[PDB]
CSV table of C-alpha atoms and ligand atoms in Angstrom, one decimal:
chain,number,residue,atom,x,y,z
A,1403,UNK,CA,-4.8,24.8,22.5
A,1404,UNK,CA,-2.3,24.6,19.4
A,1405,UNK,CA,0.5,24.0,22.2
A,1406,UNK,CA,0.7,20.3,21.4
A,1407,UNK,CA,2.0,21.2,18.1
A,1408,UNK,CA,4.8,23.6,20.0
A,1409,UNK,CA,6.2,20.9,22.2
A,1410,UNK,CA,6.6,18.6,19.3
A,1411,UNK,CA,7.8,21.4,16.8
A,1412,UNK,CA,11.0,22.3,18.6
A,1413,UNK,CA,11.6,18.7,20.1
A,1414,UNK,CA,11.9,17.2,16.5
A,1415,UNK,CA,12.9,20.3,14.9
A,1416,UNK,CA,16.2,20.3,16.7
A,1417,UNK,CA,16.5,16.7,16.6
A,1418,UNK,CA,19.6,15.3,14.4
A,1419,UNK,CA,23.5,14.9,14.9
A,1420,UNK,CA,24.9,17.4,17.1
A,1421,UNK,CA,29.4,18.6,18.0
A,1422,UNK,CA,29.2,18.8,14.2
A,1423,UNK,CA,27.5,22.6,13.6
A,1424,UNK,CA,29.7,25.4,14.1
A,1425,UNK,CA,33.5,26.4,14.9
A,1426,UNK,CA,35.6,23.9,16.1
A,1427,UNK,CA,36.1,24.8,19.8
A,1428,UNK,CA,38.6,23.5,22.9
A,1429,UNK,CA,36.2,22.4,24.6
A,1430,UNK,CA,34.6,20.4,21.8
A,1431,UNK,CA,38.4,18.7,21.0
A,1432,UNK,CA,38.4,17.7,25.1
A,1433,UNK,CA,35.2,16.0,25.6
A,1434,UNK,CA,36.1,14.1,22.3
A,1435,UNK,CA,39.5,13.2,23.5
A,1436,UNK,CA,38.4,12.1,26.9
A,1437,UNK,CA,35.9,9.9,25.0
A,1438,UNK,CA,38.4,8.3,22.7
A,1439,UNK,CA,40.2,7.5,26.0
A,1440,UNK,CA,38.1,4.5,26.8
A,1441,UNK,CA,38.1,2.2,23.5
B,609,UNK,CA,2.5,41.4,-3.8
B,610,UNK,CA,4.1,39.8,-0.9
B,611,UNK,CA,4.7,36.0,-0.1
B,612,UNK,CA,5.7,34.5,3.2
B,613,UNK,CA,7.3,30.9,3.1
B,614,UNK,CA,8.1,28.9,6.3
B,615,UNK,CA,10.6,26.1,6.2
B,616,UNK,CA,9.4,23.3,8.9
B,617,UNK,CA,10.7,19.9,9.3
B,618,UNK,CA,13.0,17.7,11.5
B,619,UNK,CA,16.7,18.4,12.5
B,620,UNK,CA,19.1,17.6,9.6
B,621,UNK,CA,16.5,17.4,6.5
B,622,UNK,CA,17.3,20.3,4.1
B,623,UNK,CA,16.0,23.5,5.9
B,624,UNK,CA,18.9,25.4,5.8
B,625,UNK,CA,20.1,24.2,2.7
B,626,UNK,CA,17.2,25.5,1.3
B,627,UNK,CA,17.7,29.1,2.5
B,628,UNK,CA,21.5,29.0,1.5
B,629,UNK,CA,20.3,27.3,-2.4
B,630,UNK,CA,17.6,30.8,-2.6
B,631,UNK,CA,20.7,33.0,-2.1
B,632,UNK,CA,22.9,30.9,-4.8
B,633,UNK,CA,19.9,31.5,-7.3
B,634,UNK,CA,17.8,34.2,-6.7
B,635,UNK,CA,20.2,36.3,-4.8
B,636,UNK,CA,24.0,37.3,-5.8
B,637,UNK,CA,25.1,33.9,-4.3
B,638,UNK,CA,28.2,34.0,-2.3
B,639,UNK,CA,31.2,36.5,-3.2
B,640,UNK,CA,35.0,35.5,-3.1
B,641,UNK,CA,34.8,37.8,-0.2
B,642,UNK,CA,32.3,35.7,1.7
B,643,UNK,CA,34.2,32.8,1.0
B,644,UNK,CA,36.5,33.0,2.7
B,645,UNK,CA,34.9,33.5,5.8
B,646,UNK,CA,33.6,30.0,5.7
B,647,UNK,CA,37.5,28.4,5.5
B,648,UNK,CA,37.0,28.3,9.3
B,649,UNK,CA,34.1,26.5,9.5
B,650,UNK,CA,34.9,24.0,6.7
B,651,UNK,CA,37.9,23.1,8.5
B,652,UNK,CA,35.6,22.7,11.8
B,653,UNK,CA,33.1,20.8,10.0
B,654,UNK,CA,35.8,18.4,8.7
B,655,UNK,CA,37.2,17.8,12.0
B,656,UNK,CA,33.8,17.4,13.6
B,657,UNK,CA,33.2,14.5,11.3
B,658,UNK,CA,36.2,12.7,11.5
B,659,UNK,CA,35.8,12.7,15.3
B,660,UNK,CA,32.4,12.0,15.7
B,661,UNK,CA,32.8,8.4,13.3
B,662,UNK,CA,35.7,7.8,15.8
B,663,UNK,CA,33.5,8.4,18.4
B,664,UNK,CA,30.8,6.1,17.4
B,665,UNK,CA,33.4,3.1,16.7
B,666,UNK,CA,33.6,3.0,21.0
B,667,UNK,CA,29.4,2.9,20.7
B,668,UNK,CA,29.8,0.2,17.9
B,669,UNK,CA,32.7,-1.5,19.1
B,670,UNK,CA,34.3,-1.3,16.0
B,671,UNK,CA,38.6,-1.3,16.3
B,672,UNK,CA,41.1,0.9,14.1
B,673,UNK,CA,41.9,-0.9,10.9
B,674,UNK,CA,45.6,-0.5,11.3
B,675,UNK,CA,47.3,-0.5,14.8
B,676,UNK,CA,49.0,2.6,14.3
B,677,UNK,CA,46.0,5.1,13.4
B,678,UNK,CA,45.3,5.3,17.4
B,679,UNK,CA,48.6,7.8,16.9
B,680,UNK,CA,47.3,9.8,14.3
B,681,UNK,CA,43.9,9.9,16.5
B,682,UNK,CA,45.7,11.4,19.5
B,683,UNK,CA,47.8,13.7,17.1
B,684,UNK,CA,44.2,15.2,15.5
B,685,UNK,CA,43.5,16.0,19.7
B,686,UNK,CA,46.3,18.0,20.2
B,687,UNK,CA,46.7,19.3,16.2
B,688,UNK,CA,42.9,20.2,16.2
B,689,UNK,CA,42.7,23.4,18.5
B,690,UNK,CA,45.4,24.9,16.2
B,691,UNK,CA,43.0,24.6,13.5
B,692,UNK,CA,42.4,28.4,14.5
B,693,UNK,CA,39.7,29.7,12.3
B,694,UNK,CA,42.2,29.4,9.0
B,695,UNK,CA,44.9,27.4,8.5
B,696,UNK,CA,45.5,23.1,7.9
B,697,UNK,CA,48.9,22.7,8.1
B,698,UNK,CA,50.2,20.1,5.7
B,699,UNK,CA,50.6,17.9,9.0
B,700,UNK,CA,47.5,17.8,10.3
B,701,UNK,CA,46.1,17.1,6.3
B,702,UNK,CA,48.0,14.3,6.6
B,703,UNK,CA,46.6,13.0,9.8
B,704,UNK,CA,42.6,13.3,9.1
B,705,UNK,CA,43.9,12.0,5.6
B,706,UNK,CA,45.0,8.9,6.9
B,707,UNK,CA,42.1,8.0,9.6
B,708,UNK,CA,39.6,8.7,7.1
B,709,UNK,CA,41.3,6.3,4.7
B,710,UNK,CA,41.2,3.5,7.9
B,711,UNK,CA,40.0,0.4,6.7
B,712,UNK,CA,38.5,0.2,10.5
B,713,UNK,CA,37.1,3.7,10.3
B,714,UNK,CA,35.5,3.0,7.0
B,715,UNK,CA,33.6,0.0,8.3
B,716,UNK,CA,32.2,2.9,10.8
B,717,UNK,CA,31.4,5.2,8.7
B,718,UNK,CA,29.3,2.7,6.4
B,719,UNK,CA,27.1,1.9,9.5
B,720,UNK,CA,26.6,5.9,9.8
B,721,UNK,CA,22.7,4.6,10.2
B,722,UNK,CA,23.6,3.5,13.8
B,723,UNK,CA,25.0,7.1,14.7
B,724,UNK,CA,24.2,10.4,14.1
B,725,UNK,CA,26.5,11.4,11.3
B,726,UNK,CA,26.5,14.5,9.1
B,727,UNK,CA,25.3,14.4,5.7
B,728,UNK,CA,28.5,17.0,4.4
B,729,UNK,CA,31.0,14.4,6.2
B,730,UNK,CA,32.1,12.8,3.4
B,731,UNK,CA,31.9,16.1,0.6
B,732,UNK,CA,34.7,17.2,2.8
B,733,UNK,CA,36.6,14.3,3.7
B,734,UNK,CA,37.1,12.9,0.3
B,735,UNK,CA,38.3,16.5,-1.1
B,736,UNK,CA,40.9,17.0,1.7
B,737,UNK,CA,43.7,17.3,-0.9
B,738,UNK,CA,41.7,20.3,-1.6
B,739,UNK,CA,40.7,21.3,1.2
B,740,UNK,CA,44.1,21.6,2.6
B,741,UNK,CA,46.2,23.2,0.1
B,742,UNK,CA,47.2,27.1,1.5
B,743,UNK,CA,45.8,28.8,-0.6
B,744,UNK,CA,42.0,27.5,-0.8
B,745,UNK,CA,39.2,30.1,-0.9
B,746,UNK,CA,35.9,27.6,-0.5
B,747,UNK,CA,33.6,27.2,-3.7
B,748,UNK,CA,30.3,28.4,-4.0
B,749,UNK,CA,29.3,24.3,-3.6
B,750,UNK,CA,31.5,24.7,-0.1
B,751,UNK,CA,30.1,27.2,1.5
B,752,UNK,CA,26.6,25.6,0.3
B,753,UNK,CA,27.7,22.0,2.7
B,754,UNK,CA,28.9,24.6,5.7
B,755,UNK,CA,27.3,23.6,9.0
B,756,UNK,CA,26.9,26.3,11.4
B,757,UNK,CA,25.3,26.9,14.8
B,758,UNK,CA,21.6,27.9,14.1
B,759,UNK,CA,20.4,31.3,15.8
B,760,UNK,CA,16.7,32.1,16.4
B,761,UNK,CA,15.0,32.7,12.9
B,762,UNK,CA,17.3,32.6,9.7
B,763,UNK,CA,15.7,35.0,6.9
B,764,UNK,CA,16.0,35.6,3.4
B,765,UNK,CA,15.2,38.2,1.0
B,766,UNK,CA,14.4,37.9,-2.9
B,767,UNK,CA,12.4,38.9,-5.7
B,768,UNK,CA,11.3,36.1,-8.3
B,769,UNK,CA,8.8,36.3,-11.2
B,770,UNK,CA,7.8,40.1,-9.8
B,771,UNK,CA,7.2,38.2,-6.2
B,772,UNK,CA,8.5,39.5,-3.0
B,773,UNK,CA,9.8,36.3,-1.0
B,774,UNK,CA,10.6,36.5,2.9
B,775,UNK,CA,12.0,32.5,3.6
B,776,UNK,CA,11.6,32.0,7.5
B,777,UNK,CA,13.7,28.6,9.0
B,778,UNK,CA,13.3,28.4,12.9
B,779,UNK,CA,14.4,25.1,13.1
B,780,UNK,CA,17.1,24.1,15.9
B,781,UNK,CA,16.6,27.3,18.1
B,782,UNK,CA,14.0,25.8,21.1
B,783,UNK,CA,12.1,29.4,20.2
B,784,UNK,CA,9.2,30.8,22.4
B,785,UNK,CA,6.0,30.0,21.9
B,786,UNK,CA,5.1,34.0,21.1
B,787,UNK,CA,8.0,34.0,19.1
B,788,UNK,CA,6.3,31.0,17.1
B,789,UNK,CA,3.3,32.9,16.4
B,790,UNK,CA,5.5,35.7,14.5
B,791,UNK,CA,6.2,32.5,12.0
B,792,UNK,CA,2.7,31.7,11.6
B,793,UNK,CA,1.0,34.9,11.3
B,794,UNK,CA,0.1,35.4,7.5
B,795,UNK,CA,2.3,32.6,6.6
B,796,UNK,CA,1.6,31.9,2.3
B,797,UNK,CA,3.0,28.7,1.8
B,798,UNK,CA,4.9,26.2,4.2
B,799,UNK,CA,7.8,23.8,3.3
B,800,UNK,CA,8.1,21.1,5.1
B,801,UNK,CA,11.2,19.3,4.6
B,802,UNK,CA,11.5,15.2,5.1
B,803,UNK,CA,15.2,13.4,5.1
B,804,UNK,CA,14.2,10.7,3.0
B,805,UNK,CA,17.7,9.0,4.0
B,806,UNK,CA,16.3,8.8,7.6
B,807,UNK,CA,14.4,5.7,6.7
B,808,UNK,CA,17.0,3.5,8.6
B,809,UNK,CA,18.3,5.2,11.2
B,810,UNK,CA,18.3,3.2,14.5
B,811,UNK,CA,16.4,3.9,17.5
B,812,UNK,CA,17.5,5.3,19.8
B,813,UNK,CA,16.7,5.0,23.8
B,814,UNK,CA,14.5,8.1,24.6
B,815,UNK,CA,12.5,7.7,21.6
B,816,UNK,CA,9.7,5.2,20.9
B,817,UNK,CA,9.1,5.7,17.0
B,818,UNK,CA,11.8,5.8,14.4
B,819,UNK,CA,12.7,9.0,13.0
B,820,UNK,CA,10.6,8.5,10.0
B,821,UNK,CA,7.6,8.4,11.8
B,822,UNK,CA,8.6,11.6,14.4
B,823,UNK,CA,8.8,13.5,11.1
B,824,UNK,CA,5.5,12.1,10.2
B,825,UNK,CA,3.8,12.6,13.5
B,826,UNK,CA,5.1,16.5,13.2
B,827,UNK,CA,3.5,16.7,8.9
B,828,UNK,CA,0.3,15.4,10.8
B,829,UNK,CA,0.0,18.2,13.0
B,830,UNK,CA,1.6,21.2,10.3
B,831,UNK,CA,-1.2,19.7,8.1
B,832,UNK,CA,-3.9,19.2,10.1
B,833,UNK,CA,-4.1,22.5,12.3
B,834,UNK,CA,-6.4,25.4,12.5
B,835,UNK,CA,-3.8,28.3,11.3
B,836,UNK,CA,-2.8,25.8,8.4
B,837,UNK,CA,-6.5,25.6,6.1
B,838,UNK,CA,-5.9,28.9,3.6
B,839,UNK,CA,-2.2,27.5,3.8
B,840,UNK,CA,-0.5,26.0,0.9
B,841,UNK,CA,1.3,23.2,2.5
B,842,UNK,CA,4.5,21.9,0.0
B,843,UNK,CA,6.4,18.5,0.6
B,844,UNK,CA,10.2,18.2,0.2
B,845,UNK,CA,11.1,14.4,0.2
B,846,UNK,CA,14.6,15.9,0.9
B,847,UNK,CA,17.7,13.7,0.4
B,848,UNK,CA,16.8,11.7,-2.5
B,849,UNK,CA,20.5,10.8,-4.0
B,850,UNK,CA,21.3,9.4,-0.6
B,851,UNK,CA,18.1,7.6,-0.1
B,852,UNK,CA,18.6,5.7,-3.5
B,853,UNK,CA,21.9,4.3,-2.7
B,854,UNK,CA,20.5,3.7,0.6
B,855,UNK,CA,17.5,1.8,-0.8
B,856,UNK,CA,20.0,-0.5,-2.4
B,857,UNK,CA,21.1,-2.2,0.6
B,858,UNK,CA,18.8,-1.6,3.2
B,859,UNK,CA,15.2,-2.6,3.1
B,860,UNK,CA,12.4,0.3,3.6
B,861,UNK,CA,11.0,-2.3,5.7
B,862,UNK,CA,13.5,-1.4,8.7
B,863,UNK,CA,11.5,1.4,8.8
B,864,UNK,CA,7.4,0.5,7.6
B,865,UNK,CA,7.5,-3.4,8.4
B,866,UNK,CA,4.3,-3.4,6.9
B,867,UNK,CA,5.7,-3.0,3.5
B,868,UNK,CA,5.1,-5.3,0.9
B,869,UNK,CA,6.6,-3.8,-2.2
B,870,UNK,CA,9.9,-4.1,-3.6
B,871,UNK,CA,13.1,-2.6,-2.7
B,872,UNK,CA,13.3,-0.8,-5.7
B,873,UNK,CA,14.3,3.2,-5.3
B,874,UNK,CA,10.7,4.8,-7.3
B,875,UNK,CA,8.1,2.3,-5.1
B,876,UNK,CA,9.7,3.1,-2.3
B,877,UNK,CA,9.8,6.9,-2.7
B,878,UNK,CA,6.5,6.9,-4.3
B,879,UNK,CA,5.4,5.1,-0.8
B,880,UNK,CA,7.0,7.0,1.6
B,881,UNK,CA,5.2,9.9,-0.1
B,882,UNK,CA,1.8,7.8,0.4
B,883,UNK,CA,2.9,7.6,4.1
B,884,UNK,CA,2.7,12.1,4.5
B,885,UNK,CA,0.0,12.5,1.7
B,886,UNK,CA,-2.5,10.9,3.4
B,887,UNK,CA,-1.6,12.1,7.4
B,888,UNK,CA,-4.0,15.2,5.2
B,889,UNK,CA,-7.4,14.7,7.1
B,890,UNK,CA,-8.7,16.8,4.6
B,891,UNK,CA,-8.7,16.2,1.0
B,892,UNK,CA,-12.6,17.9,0.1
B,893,UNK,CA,-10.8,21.5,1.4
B,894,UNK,CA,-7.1,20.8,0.7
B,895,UNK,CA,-4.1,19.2,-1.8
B,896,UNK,CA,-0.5,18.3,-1.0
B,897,UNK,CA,2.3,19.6,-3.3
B,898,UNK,CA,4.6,17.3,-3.2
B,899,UNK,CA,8.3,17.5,-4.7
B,900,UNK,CA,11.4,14.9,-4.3
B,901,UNK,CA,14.1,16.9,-4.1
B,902,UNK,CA,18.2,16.7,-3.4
B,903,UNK,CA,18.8,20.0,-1.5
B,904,UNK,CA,22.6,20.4,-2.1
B,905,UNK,CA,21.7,20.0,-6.3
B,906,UNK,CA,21.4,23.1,-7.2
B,907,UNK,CA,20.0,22.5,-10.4
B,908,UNK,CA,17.0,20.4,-9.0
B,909,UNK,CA,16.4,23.1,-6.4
B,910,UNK,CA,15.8,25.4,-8.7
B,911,UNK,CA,13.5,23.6,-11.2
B,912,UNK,CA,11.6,22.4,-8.1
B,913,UNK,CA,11.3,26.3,-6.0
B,914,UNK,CA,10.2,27.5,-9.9
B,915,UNK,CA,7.3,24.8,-10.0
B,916,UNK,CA,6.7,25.9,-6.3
B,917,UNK,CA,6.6,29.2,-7.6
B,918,UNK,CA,3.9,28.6,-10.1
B,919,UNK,CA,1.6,27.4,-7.6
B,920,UNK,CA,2.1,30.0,-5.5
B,921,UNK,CA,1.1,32.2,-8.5
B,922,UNK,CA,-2.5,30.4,-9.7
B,923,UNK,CA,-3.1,30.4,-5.5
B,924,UNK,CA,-3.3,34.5,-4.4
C,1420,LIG,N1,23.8,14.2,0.0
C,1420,LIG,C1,22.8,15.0,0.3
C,1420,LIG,N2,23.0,15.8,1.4
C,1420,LIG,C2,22.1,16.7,1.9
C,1420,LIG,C3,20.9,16.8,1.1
C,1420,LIG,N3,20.1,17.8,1.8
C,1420,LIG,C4,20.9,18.2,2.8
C,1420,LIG,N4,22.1,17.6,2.9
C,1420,LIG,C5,23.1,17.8,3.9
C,1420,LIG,O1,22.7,17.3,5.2
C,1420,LIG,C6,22.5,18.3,6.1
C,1420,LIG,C7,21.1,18.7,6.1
C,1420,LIG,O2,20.8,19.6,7.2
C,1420,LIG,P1,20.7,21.2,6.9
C,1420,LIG,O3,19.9,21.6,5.7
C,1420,LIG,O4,22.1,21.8,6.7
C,1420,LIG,O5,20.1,21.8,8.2
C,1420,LIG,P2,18.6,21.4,8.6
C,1420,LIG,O6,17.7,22.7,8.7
C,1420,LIG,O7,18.6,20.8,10.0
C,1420,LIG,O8,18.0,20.4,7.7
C,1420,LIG,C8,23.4,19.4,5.6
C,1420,LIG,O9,24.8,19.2,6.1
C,1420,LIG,C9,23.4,19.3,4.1
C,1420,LIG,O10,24.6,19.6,3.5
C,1420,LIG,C10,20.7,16.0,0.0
C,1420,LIG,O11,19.6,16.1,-0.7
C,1420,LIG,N5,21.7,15.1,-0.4
């Protein structure tokens, strides 16, 4: 097959912490206020 | 001739860095030009940091060290979206400046193995006072800790000891399975890179093995395929400063509770390295090159890619 390997290569390959690559967008600073809006 | 190298590995392991550390040696490196560019991001990258360990103190329960820095929180909100592209003002320096310095946000940011947190959050955060200032062009050891949003395949071009290198990193990008195959296709060597520094990150709810052992679970299947036999197949143990602070405190049996030796930083290393070594079904028809490496060190990246280089040489 050598599909097994494709599932799992772009699942863990694009694993890690994510709203933390890139430019710093609107949309980015709401969902991060509404958050900090409960605790 | 010509030599293809693939960069493979999990999400936040050294990929990129990689790709970036081949331009700062065997390339120009990054002009004052180029620079500035990045001023942006680093500002975004900053920001993104801050927020998401403020974040992760409503996940953790964790409250503000002083009253007041819930302010200075809802001030970085409104403050933030004027971060446009290039330009800190002095106020909003002052702001991150403060929450980072939280005796509440510190305890937070020490438990950063209960969250996803970036590994350039604290580079930036502890240099704010130069960060900030107005007229601040990024270093070339800046624009190396940039975080930016990965697109499709990320290529590099350079010529080392009379060797033409093309550097693929896919990584991120869910990419087509044809588009995959492009990757593959005459493919010299592989690097596949392993965050040592994930060792005790906490489980999440969708996934049932720790990070450790998803990165392993991938090396056994890089390793042990069909395209991969006439494949060179080179180990990063990526993030070895971090892991040996790490090591100090935390146990390498959070993540092999099998583990009998000590929490000392070379055993441990040495068996985590064990742990991907020997995921090779084949050791009669094929030989891991294995390398501990610390992918923002410049210095180490380039003594390690030049030993890399040498058995690519004494392979063709
Ligand atoms: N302290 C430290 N940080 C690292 C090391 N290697 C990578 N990082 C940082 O952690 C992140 C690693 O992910 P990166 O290489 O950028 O993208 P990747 O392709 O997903 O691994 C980047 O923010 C790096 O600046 C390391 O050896 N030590």
């Amino acid at each position: 097959d050598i599909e097994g390997l494709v599932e799992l290569l772009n699942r863990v390959q694009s694993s890690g912490a994510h709203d933390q690559r890139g430019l710093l967008s609107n949309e980015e600073v709401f969902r991060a206020l509404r958050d900090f809006d409960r605790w | 001739r010509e030599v293809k190298l693939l960069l493979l590995g999990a999400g936040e392991s050294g990929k990129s860095t990689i790709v970036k550390q081949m331009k700062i040696i065997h390339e120009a490196g990054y002009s004052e030009e180029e620079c500035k560019q990045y001023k942006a991001v680093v500002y975004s990258n900053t920001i993104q940091s801050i927020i998401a360990i403020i974040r992760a103190m409503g996940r953790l329960k964790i409250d503000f060290g002083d009253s007041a820095r819930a302010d200075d929180a809802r001030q970085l909100f409104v403050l933030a979206g004027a971060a446009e592209e290039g330009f800190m003002t002095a106020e909003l320096a002052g702001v991150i400046k403060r929450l980072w310095k939280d005796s509440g946000v510190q305890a937070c940011f020490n438990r950063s193995r209960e969250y996803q947190l970036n590994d350039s959050a604290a580079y930036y955060l502890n240099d704010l006072d130069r960060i900030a200032q107005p007229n601040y062009i990024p270093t070339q050891q800046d624009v190396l800790r940039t975080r930016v949003k990965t697109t499709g395949i990320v290529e590099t071009h350079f010529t080392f000891k009379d060797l033409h290198f093309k550097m693929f990193d896919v990584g991120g990008q869910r990419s087509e399975r044809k588009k995959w195959i492009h990757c593959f296709e005459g493919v010299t060597a592989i690097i596949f890179c392993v965050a040592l520094s994930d060792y005790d990150l906490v489980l999440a709810e969708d996934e049932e093995m720790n990070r450790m052992h998803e990165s392993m679970k991938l090396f056994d299947s890089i390793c042990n395929n069909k395209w991969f036999t006439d494949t060179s197949i080179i180990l990063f143990l990526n993030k070895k400063d971090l892991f040996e602070e790490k090591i100090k405190k935390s146990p390498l049996t959070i993540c092999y509770p099998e583990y009998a030796g000590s929490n000392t930083y070379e055993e441990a290393a040495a068996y985590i390295q064990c742990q991907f070594e020997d995921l090779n079904k084949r050791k009669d028809t094929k030989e891991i090159y294995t390398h501990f490496t610390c992918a923002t060190d410049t210095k180490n990246v380039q003594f390690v890619f030049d030993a890399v280089t040498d058995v690519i040489i004494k392979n063709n």
